[PDB]
Structure 1
Amino acid sequence: GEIQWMRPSKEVGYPIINAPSKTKLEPSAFHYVFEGVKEPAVLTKNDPRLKTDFEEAIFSKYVGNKITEVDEYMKEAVDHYAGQLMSLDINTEQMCLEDAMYGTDGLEALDLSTSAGYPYVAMGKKKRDILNKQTRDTKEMQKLLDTYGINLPLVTYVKDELRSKTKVEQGKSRLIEASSLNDSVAMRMAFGNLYAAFHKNPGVITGSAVGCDPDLFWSKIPVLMEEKLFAFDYTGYDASLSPAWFEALKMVLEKIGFGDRVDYIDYLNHSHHLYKNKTYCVKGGMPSGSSGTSIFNSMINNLIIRTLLLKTYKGIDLDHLKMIAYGDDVIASYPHEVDASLLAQSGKDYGLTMTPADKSATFETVTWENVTFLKRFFRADEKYPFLIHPVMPMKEIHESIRWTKDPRNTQDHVRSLCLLAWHNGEEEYNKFLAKIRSVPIGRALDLPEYSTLYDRWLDSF
């Protein structure tokens, strides 16, 4: 991705967009009970903690576009992935406005807490005022679609979240590029059934895990993998995507029956954004807050891995490439050992910056013992080995419990953390609960004991 130009929104007929300048994150009742070093991300250029220009830092993710056209290796990757998706018999029919708005099997209703984007954010009109779950009324939306149309500017917001001291000082805050409610709705009508098919089929056929439930899905992953695992991290995946990758995605959609609306992908590829009082045009780069962002990033990841394997290992049998992606995150396998370092070398030529899995200093062999997916390790249950525990290290959990964004949600926040933590074992889980109950706020919470969560886990299969 590359920013073509940027300048005052008034010069192109757009208004100044207001965005909060203060974080909602504040120390929680457990701030001094657990260890942690993360703090709220910088949200404004005048943050005292900054040690470099803010705006330059937040837009530096657009490293440019390395490739222009789709080459032979990419075309082969497209044919293979599309062929694989064809076995799913995905309903290519457009989804009706009602379901696209309020959900159906395999697709949750539109989130009412998220931004409605332009022009609603500038008119002070919110989602609450447009849709109603109890009625499932589409009349208001339809009128708004007819009035403002589609392909509207995406509104940029700085993401309010925790980050390492370094990322804070370097102004490396992540951004939310929110599609207008009109575009979100239009894209869900266009691809709603595709989204549902992926959500209902996490695995090695879709090569996707979006919509998955880790507590249950972890036991299914090992059986789908080939003998030798391989993986790697990407540096700024979304923003590094060149226009050619969007064209390859369109080719896949055409081959599976959605050639009808590949134009929606152009909206993602060549897009314009509003940030404060400026407007900018980007060539390439996947927007972070658009309908289908995670699914399309996942599909493209399937294309990327296939392309690099074909380019690096002529004669590779892609029918034995078994991979599962969640956006840029991926767990992959092949019957034979492959060199991730070599694949990373080939990736540079395609505009992708690939590094050792989980921040390793060097590319090491990936094993069931050290592999992670969505930050979770895989550990067989001591009593019933066929049941696989998704294990997220206590470090992330401790960092999280030390802050709050609304005291009213303390109970939900802590329970969510308990659902992740117990997989670390009874000894660790009990220590976690004891620390929580060392302060008044923690003692007033209703939290499940270990045996309760273990029994609930067994009963969920």
Structure 2
Amino acid sequence: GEIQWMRPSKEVGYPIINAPSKTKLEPSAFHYVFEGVKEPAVLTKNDPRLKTDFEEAIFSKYVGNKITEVDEYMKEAVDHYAGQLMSLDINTEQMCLEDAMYGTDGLEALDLSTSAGYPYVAMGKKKRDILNKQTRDTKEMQKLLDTYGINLPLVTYVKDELRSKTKVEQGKSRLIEASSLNDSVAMRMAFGNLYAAFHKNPGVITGSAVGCDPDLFWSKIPVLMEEKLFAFDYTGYDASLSPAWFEALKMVLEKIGFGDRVDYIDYLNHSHHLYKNKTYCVKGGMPAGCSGTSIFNSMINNLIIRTLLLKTYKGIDLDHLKMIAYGDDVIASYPHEVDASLLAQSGKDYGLTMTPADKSATFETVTWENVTFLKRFFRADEKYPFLIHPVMPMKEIHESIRWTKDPRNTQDHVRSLCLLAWHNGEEEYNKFLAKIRSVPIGRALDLPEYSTLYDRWLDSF
């Protein structure tokens, strides 16, 4: 991805957009009960903690575009992945406005919380004023579509979240490039059934895990994998995507029956954004921060891995590549060992920066013992080995519980963390609960005991 130009929005007929400058994150009642080192990300140029230009830092993610056209290796990758998706008999029919808005089997309703984007953000109009869960009214939305159309600028927001001290000082805050409600709705009408099919089929055929439930899905992943695992991390995946990857995605869509609306992919590839009082044009790069792009980023990841394997290992049998992606995150396997370091080298030529899995200093063999997916390790249950626990280390959980964004959601926040932590074992879980109950706020919470969670897990299969 590359920024073509940037300048005063006024010069191009757009208004100044107002975005919060103060974090909603504040120390929680557990701030001194647990260890942690993360702080709220810098949200403005004037933040005292900054040690470099903020504007430069947040847009440095656009490293440029390494490739223009789709080569022969990418074409083969497209043919193989598209052929694989064809086995799912995905309904190519457009989804009606109602379901696209309020959800249906395999697709959740629009998030009434998130931004409505332009121009609604500048008109002070919220989603709550357009959508009616109880009525499932599409009248209002339909008139807004007719009035403002599609292909609207994306509203850029800085993400309010915890970051390491280094990322804070270097102003390395992540961004949210919100699509207008109009575009979000139009894209779900065009691809709604595709989204539903992926959400309903997490695994090695879709090569996707979006919409998955780790508590249950972890037990299914191992049997789908080939003998030798391989993985790696990407540095700034979304922003690094070159225009060629978007063209390869359109080819996949065309082959599976959506050639009808590949134009929507262009909107993601060549897009314009509004940030504060400026407007800018980007070539390449997947608009980041929102879930609406999770599926497309996952599909593209399937194309990238296939391409690098074909380019690095002529004669590779893709029918035996078994991988599952969630955006840029991935767990993959093949019957034979492969060299991730070599694959990373090939990746540079395609505009991708690949590094050792889980932040290792060197590319080491990936095993069921050290592999992680969505930050969770895999651990067989002591009593029932066939049941696999998704294990997220307590470090991140401890980092999270030390801050709060709303005193009213304290119990939901802590309960969600408990659902993650108990997988670490009864001993660790009880220590976690004991510390929570060492302060008044914690003692007033209704939290599940270990045996209660273990029983509920067994009863969920």
Say if 1:27 and 1:402, in contact at 8 Å, map to a contact too: yes
Q: Conserved in 2, the CA contact under 8 Å of 1:179 and 1:291?
A: no
Quickly say closer, same or farther: Cα 1:201–1:109, change in 2 above 3 A.
same
2:289 and 2:265 map into 1 onto residues whose CA distance is 14
User: Any idea what the Cα deviations from partners look like across 1:163-193, whole Å, max 9, x if unmatched?
Assistant: 0000000000000000000000000000000
CA–CA separation in structure 2 for the residues paired with 1:363 and 1:222: 22
Q: Secondary structure at the match of 1:173?
A: coil
- Give me the whole-angstrom Cα distance separating, in 2, the residues matched to 1:417 and 1:308: 37
C-alpha change, 1:318 and 1:421, in structure 2 (3 Å) is same
Structure 1 stretches of 4+ moved >2 Å: 289-292
2-structure distance, mates of 1:70, 1:147: 37
Residues 241 and 286 in structure 2, CA contact (< 8 A), matched pair in contact too: yes
Q: Deviations over 1:220-250 (max 9, x none)?
A: 0000000000000000000000000000000
The alpha carbon displacement at 1:442 in A equals 0.1
Cα distance in 2 for residues equivalent to 1:216 and 1:6: 46
2-side partners of 1:289 and 1:24: how far apart? 18
Equivalent pair of 1:429/1:450 in contact (CA under 8 Å): yes
CA deviations 1:180-230 (Å, max 9, x no partner) are 000000000000000000000000000000000000000000000000000
Give TM-score scaled by structure 1 length.
1.00
Q: For the residues of structure 2 that align with 1:138 and 1:368, how far apart are their CA atoms?
A: 48
Any idea what the Cα deviations from partners look like across 1:90-124, whole Å, max 9, x if unmatched?
00000000000000000000000000000000000
Bigger Cα displacement from structure 2, 288-297 vs 203-212: 288-297
Q: Distance in 2 between matches of 1:190 and 1:111?
A: 18
2:346 and 2:297 map into 1 onto residues whose CA distance is 19
Q: 1:159, 1:347 → 2: CA distance?
A: 28
2:78 partner SS: helix
Deviations 1:329-359 (A, max 9, x none): 0000000000000000000000000000000
Q: How far is the alpha carbon of 1:323 from its aligned partner?
A: 0.0
Instruction: Flag the 1:64–1:200 CA change in 2: closer, same or farther, 3 A.
Output: same
Inter-partner Cα distance in structure 2 for 1:420 and 1:291: 21
On the 8 A contact 1:90/1:193 being kept in 2, the answer is: yes
Q: Deviations over 1:258-309 (max 9, x none)?
A: 0000000000000000000000000000001456300000000000000000
Instruction: Answer yes or no: is the 8 Å Cα contact 1:230–1:338 preserved in 2.
Output: yes
> How many residues end up aligned between the 2 structures?
461
Pair 1:42–1:292, CA change in 2 (3 A): same
CA–CA distance in structure 1, aligned partners of residues 96 and 133 of structure 2: 16
Partner of 2:352 in structure 1?
Answer: 352
Give distance in 1, aligned partners of 2:288 and 2:76: 28
Post-superposition Cα deviations, 1:353-385, rounded to whole Å, max 9, x if no partner, equal 000000000000000000000000000000000
Q: C-alpha displacement at 1:17, in angstroms?
A: 0.1
Asked if the contact 1:195–1:292 (Cα under 8 Å) also holds between the matched residues in 2, the reply is no
Over the aligned positions, Cα root-mean-square deviation in angstroms equals 0.5
Residue equivalent to 1:7: 7
Give the Cα–Cα distance (whole angstroms) in 2 for the partners of residues 375 and 319 of structure 1: 27
Greater CA deviation, 382-391 or 287-296? Answer: 287-296
In 1, Cα distance between equivalents of 2:119 and 2:347: 39
CA distance in 1, matches of 2:174, 2:289: 12
Distance in structure 2 (CA, Å) of the matches to 1:427 and 1:67: 52
SS of alignment partner, residue 291 of structure 2: coil
1: CA distance, partners of 2:5 / 2:414: 44
Give runs of aligned pairs for residues 439-450 of structure 1, distance below 5 A: 439-450=439-450
Contact 1:52 1:170 in 2 (8 A): yes
Equivalent residues in 2 for 1:404-415, closer than 5 Å: 404-415=404-415
- CA distances 1:391-420 after superposition (whole Å, capped 9, x unpaired): 000000000000000000000000000000
Q: Structure 1 residue 254: deviation in Å?
A: 0.1
Q: Following superposition of structure 1 onto structure 2, how do residues 48-447 of structure 1 map, counting pairs within 5 Å?
A: 48-289=48-289, 292-447=292-447
Distance 2:386 2:292 in 1: 33
Q: Residue 389 of structure 1: CA displacement?
A: 0.0
238-247 or 280-289, which deviates more? 280-289
Unpaired runs of 5+ residues, structure 2, are none
Relative to structure 1, the CA distance from residue 352 to residue 28 in structure 2 (aligned partners, 3 Å threshold; closer, same or farther) is same
CA–CA distance in 2 between the matches of 1:366 and 1:92?
37
Q: Quick check: 2:131–2:137 contact (8 Å CA) kept in 1?
A: yes
Q: Confirm or deny: 8 A CA contact 1:184 1:290 kept in the other structure.
A: no
For residues 316 and 21 of structure 1, what CA distance do their matches in structure 2 show?
51
Take 2:290 and 2:99, find their aligned partners in 1: how far apart are those partners? 18
Aligned partners of 2:30, 2:427: CA distance in 1, in Å?
20
More deviation in 253-262 or 281-290? 281-290
Secondary structure in 1 matching 2:7: strand
Kept in 1: contact 2:230–2:332 (CA 8 A): yes
Deviates further, 287-296 or 383-392: 287-296
CA distance in 1, matches of 2:301, 2:46: 37
Supply the distance in 1 between the matched residues of 2:412 and 2:359 (Cα, whole angstroms): 31
Q: Is the 8 A contact 1:25 1:404 kept in 2?
A: yes
The alpha-carbon deviation at position 438 of structure 1 amounts to 0.1
The 1-side partners of 2:38 and 2:284 are apart by: 31
In the alignment, the residues of structure 2 paired with residue 370 and residue 131 of structure 1 have an alpha-carbon distance, to the nearest angstrom, of: 45
The answer (yes or no) to whether the contact 2:176–2:290 under 8 Å persists in 1 is no
